Amino acid sequence: AITADDIAVQYPIPTYRFIVTLGDEQVPFTSASGLDINFDTIEYRDGTG
Amino acid sequence: AITADDIAVQYPIPTYRFIVTLGDEQVPFTSASGLDINFDTIEYRDGTG
């Protein structure tokens, strides 16, 4: 017994059901990708290690 | 078969590992350059060659 209210808590979410709110309107889209969070890298080395 | 105690005697030394003691203390630096020994030159020519 898995009692589907527990599926809504601890099972993962698929990617086929999504609403795109575009400004103040909803527009139906087929695909959506590229919503990444990317940083750069600072590095610094001295002679001691 | 080279047994790295022989690397410490025979192989050269790389530049990236160095410490700089400046007076009574050590300060961690990134680069260090310009420790040259440069001489001038004196000449003399006479008529016989």
Side-chain angles (χ1 to χ4, degrees), chain B residues 18-36:
Chain B
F18 65 99
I19 58 170
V20 179
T21 299
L22 174 49
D24 293 330
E25 61 185 1
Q26 291 187 359
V27 178
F29 288 96
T30 304
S31 298
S33 67
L35 290 87
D36 303 335

Side-chain angles (χ1 to χ4, degrees), chain A residues 21-34:
Chain A
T21 301
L22 173 49
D24 54 353
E25 296 179 354
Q26 294 181 359
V27 176
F29 287 96
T30 301
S31 297
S33 66

